[PDB]
Write a protein that binds this ligand. Structure first.
Ligand SMILES: [Cl-]
Length: 299
């Protein structure tokens, strides 16, 4: 589908919309628990946002093709590092603390670059769905902090711990793009009672164009001692170090898995820190039995 005007009932943001900024449309929602939506027309929006709406909010970006992130024309950008902002969350260009939030075809970036942690988006709520979005940074790009989250046909770009936190999160058909040496995931799963996983499924892991990172990228390292991550049914380019995984938390006992991956970085013979698994995990394991209620199936 093309989405070139506001879907039914949505507030409009843009040069020729009701609101000039995304923040103004968010503010206009006020204190309601009704479901709502906002359509954002093409543009670069220099804004830092907290999504804390009480109801179920959907944020749609304009695009000629909703099925991909590649034609996105809406970018939300802001630049600050966590040392300057005061916390990881306060560094985020977009901070999602509203359950049931969905975002379609929007690009989110932190323009800080290499040198310190600078979050593009923090997901800190349950039943979060992201479809055809881009998330760009260097260190700590995508803070999957907590809650059940689903990313489909997204582009996640970074270098150092650029998917990190304790969300239970499923990445499907995403392009995961390294723009520097480092570990892709940094799960903070920390106790046995924590039922969370990161699952990277039918994804494509590769270098950013123009950057040579042969064997300089790790699938992950453990931010806390019980980090749990599986890469399955995915393509891994030659960026992946033969060891696969590296270290971080002292005394870590990570649960790190690979299943049915292909590509030049998919040879497992020299891996370290892995555990055997005989089948891929499913979304019921990662997100719970109710995932069919909130995930956009039609997408
Ligand atoms: Cl919190």
């Amino acid at each position: 589908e093309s989405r070139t005007s506001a879907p039914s009932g949505c507030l409009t943001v843009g040069s020729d919309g009701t609101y000039s900024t995304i923040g103004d449309a968010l503010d206009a929602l006020g204190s309601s628990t009704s479901s709502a939506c906002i359509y954002v027309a093409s543009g670069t929006y220099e804004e830092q946002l907290t999504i804390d709406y009480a109801g179920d909010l959907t944020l749609y970006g304009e695009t000629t093709d909703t099925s991909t992130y590649k034609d996105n024309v809406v970018t939300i950008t802001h630049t600050i590092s966590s040392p300057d902002a005061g916390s990881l969350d306060k560094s985020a260009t977009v901070n999602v603390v509203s359950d049931g939030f969905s975002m379609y075809n929007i690009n989110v970036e932190n323009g800080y670059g290499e040198g310190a942690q600078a979050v593009a988006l923090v997901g800190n709520a349950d039943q979060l769905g992201f479809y055809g979005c881009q998330f760009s940074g260097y260190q700590d790009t995508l803070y999957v902090k907590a809650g059940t989250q689903y990313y489909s046909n997204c582009m996640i770009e970074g270098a150092v711990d650029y998917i990190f936190g304790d969300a239970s999160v499923w990445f499907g058909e995403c392009d995961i793009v390294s723009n520097g040496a480092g570990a892709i995931t940094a799960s903070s799963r920390e106790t046995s009672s924590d039922s969370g996983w990161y699952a990277i499924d039918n994804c494509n892991i590769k270098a950013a164009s123009g950057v040579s990172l042969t064997e300089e990228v790790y699938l992950g390292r453990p931010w806390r001692v019980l980090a749990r991550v599986i890469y399955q049914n995915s393509v891994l380019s030659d960026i992946i170090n033969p060891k696969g995984w590296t270290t971080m938390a002292d005394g870590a006992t990570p649960l790190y898995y690979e299943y049915n991956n292909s590509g030049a970085g998919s040879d497992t013979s020299d891996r370290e820190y892995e555990t055997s698994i005989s089948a891929a995990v499913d979304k019921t394991t990662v997100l719970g039995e109710t995932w069919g209620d909130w995930i956009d199936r039609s997408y």
